[PDB]
Design a protein around this ligand. Structure first.
Ligand SMILES: C[C@H](C[C@@H](C[C@H](C[C@@H](C[C@@H](CCN1CCCC1=O)N1CCCC1=O)N1CCCC1=O)N1CCCC1=O)N1CCCC1=O)N1CCCC1=O
Ligand SMILES: Nc1ncnc2c1ncn2CCNC(=O)c1nc(-c2ccccc2C(F)(F)F)[nH]c(=O)c1O
Ligand SMILES: [Mn+2]
Ligand SMILES: [Mn+2]
Length: 178
């Protein structure tokens, strides 16, 4: 039982922790062992949720659901809006901008992480939005979807999590593991 596991459980709302646990066990991974990946799965989950709570019924949340139902909704959006079915599961869908969104949270330079995912998805359709634990962000065609206030809020949350890890001497392992 690690210090990181107890921190994760005390730092994040219980629904987020359980969803992160479910996702990992779906891929055979143990939150009790891969504890830095545990914290990461939760942050990304929280960021996605804060992101969806930043617009007006504007976004359809795709992250958090089980694989099959996530794809079911993706197909239903694709066969309603016309948009082609993504190669990989996205994180949200914008009914206002009419595009899927891939959210990223990284401990490295925002450029590197965006480039990796863009080359990964290849399709010019799914919109990419990267956040860092230092408050930078980078989004496709410089289009950041939400208003600055809701996005700055996410960056503040990420930096508070980073400081909380540091005070507990867990940050260096977390950063040195992505
Ligand atoms: C107190 C308040 C609570 C948050 C909760 C919300 C997370 C998310 C909840 C679940 C619903 C579960 N299932 C099971 C299957 C069908 C289904 O839907 N999932 C996961 C998959 C998508 C989804 O819907 N929901 C519910 C409503 C919309 C939403 O996104 N959110 C959004 C902000 C961060 C967060 O946690 N709510 C409730 C509405 C307003 C709000 O903020 N919190 C917690 C801390 C911050 C905060 O404000
Ligand atoms: N290794 C895995 N473990 C559980 N589930 C996995 C999964 N790979 C795929 N899936 C299912 C669908 N995954 C996603 O959608 C998704 N995964 C990530 C990611 C990837 C690797 C390590 C940590 C992360 C995370 F950022 F969460 F912490 N980042 C995203 O931005 C994102 O959208
Ligand atoms: Mn995802
Ligand atoms: Mn993502």
């Amino acid at each position: 039982g690690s210090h990181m596991e107890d921190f994760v459980r005390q730092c994040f709302n219980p629904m987020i922790v359980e969803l992160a646990e479910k996702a990992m066990k779906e891929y055979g991974e143990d939150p009790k062992i891969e504890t830095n990946k545990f914290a990461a799965t939760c942050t990304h989950l929280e960021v996605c949720f804060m992101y969806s709570d930043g617009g007006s019924h504007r976004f359809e949340i795709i992250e958090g659901r089980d694989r099959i139902m996530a794809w079911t909704v993706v197909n239903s959006i694709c066969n309603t809006t016309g948009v082609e079915k993504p190669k990989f599961l996205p994180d949200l869908y914008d009914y206002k901008e009419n595009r899927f969104i891939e959210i990223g949270v990284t401990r490295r330079e925002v450029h590197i992480y965006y480039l990796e995912k863009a080359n990964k998805i290849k399709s010019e359709k799914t919109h990419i939005h990267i956040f860092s634990f230092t408050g930078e962000e980078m989004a496709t065609k410089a289009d950041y979807t939400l208003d600055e206030e809701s996005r700055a809020r996410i960056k503040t949350r990420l930096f508070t999590i980073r400081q909380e890890m540091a005070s507990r001497s867990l940050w260096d392992s977390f950063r040195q593991s992505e």
